Amino acid sequence: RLKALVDAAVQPVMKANDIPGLAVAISLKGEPHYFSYGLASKEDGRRVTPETLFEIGSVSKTFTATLAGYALAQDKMRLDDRASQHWPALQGSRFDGISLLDLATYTAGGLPLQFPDSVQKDQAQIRDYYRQWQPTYAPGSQRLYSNPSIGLFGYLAARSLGQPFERLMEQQLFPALGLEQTHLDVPEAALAQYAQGYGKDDRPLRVGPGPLDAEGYGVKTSAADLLRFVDANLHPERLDRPWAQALDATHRGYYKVGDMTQGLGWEAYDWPISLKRLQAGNSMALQPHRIARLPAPQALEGQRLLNKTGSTNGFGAYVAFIPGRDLGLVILANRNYPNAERVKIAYAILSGL
Numbered sequence: 068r069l070k071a072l073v074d075a076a077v078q079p080v081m082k083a084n085d086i087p088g089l090a091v092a093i094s095l096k097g098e099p100h101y102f103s104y105g106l107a108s109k110e111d112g113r114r115v116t117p118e119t120l121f122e123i124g125s126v127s128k129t130f131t132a133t134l135a136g137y138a139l140a141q142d143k144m145r146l147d148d149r150a151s152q153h154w155p156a157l158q159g160s161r162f163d164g165i166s167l168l169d170l171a172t173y174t175a176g177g178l179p180l181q182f183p184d185s186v187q188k189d190q191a192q193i194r195d196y197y198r199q200w201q202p203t204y205a206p207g208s209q210r211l212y213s214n215p216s217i218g219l220f221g222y223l224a225a226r227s228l229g230q231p232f233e234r235l236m237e238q239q240l241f242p243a244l245g246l247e248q249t250h251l252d253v254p255e256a257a258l259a260q261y262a263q264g265y266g267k268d269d270r271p272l273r274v275g276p277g278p279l280d281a282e283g284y285g286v287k288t289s290a291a292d293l294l295r296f297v298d299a300n301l302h303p304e305r306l307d308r309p310w311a312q313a314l315d316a317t318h319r320g321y322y323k324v325g326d327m328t329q330g331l332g333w334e335a336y337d338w339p340i341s342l343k344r345l346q347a348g349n350s351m352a353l354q355p356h357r358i359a360r361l362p363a364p365q366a367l368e369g370q371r372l373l374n375k376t377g378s379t380n381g382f383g384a385y386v387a388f389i390p391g392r393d394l395g396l397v398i399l400a401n402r403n404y405p406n407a408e409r410v411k412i413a414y415a416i417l418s419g420l
Contacts (some may be wrong), residue, residue, distance in 0.1 A: 069093075076415030077398075081105060084404035087265055088115035090290035091412075094388070094395030095420060101290060103252070106308045107262035107401065109269065114355030117291040119247075120253060120261045122274050122395050123216075123384040124377030127286040129300075129317060130249075131221035134232070134240050135171065136316030140309045144227035146171070153223040156194045161201050162219075169206045170220035171331050173320050175399075176202025177209070178216040180353055183398070188276040191348050196278075203393045210324055211353035216280030233281045248292040253286040261287065262401040264381015272381030273293050286380060290366035290397050298394035300333075300373070318373070318390070320365035320404075322358035328365065329358075333373040338389055342414045346407040349376050372417070378403045385409035387417065395419055 073091055081089050081104055101117040120299045133228035134400035138144045144153060146168035153167075161176075170221075171177040172417050178200070186196045187221040197219060225232035233251050241249050253261050260352035264272035274284065298304060320328035320335055327348045329333040336345055367373055367390070374387040 069095075070102065073100075073416055073420040075404065076412045076419070077102065077104055080404075080412050084402060084408055086400045086402045086404055088119070088262060088305055089398065089400045089404030090115050090117060090119055090121065091416075092117060092290035092397040093416065093420075094230050094294055094301065094394055095181060095391070098289070100292055103290075107260075109263070109265070111360070111418050114402070115262070118248060118260055118289045119399075120248070120257065120289055121311055121384060122264060122285045122379040122382035123286045124274075124382060125383045126375045126386055127282070127284050128217050128377075129332035129375050129386070130236065130240065130286055130296070131217060131224070131232075131282045132171065132317045132330075133169075133244075133313050134235055135224035135331060136226075136313035137240065137309060138224045138227045140312035141228070141296065142297050144224060144413065146254060147188045150175075150219065150223055151227045157197055157407075160198045162197060165202075166205050167220060167223060168321065170223070171215050172329050173210045173213050174207050174322075174358060176204050176206045177355065178213040178219075180211070180213055182215050182278045186278050188278050188280065190269045191279050191418035195353055204355070207360075210322070210329065210356065210358050211355040212353065216281040218282040218347060222279055222306055225385060233285070233369035236293075243307065245295055246292050249286060249288040249296070251281045251287075258284075260289070262382075264379065265342060265402050270275075272379070274379040274381070284377065289305075292400065292401050293386060293397045294395060297397060301388055301393055301395055303331070318367040318368050319369050321359045324358055326355045328361075328367065328371075330367050330373070333339060333367065333375060335367045336372045337372070338370050338372045339352050342411065343390040345372070345374075345414060346410045349410050350375070374413075376406045376409060383409060385413055386411050389417065392420075
């Protein structure tokens with residue numbers, strides 16, 4: 068019956084969006100279920116499994132937010148810190164007037180969707196980009212989804228912990244969460260599991276280097292590992308206490324835009340909610356939106372769906388969980404297919420359950 072539900076949701080969307088390979092992982096009342104479809108690589112006929120690695124794009128921001136939650140748990144930073152506190156190169160810049168919370172929640176005052184193409188993956192170019200940046204509008208007022216914004220949040224969280232971001236993730240966070248199939252830099256030994264991504268004319272696409280790529284979109288992981296991360300989010304209380312607190316920090320809402328409540332990484336909706344509303348919330352116009360700030364930060368628990376979409380040029384990921392129902396869902400594909408279609412699969416499954 069579960070195969071029928073998941074096949075009925077996935078099969079027409081894979082066919083309609085020409086998705087070569089797609090992995091589903093579901094956590095249902097504490098039990099994992101895997102549904103694997105199609106080809107990780109069309110050219111060598113390698114089938115998707117629950118161990119296939121996919122690029123998860125901006126779903127990486129939920130990992131970045133968890134690392135920041137770990138720095139918060141250790142009192143190495145606070146969300147009301149001025150951003151420039153954690154990086155002397157920014158002292159005297161406009162980051163003297165911008166909080167870590169503003170960076171995490173895309174309200175620093177108009178940091179753009181992407182770094183300009185002039186900014187290469189280079190420490191000095193990234194430093195100089197932030198040193199010269201000036202807000203378009205007041206920090207704290209308007210949300211504009213931004214890689215530079217949450218990328219700097221992750222970079223500063225790493226500085227507060229005294230080590231590079233990529234090292235902290237590999238040496239501390241991934242082991243603490245029991246993730247052995249989750250990578251920022253896939254080992255040569257794991258490359259056999261790395262799915263091919265597909266674009267226009269099935270051009271092959273694996274993500275290339277970019278500024279603060281690890282913080283914004285660096286993670287490659289399996290459906291089985293990303294469900295382990297969802298299960299850590301459903302049950303933080305099972306982890307050693309600093310990591311329980313790190314995960315809890317990503318379950319705190321700061322403001323509403325439309326139906327969406329913005330946390331660190333995670334974006335939350337009331338549940339139940341219509342499919343069309345969940346699609347609209349995940350299909351954001353890329354202009355700034357005025358926020359409705361919450362009088363106090365809100366626990367993101369109970370009758371809520373927490374979710375995150377993420378994409379690279381070759382891949383399309385979606386993760387969602389319902390704390391109050393102990394239900395988790397991962398959908399990883401090796402095509403960047405529309406967010407609304409990813410939500411269509413997920414909604415069919417979550418409503419079905």
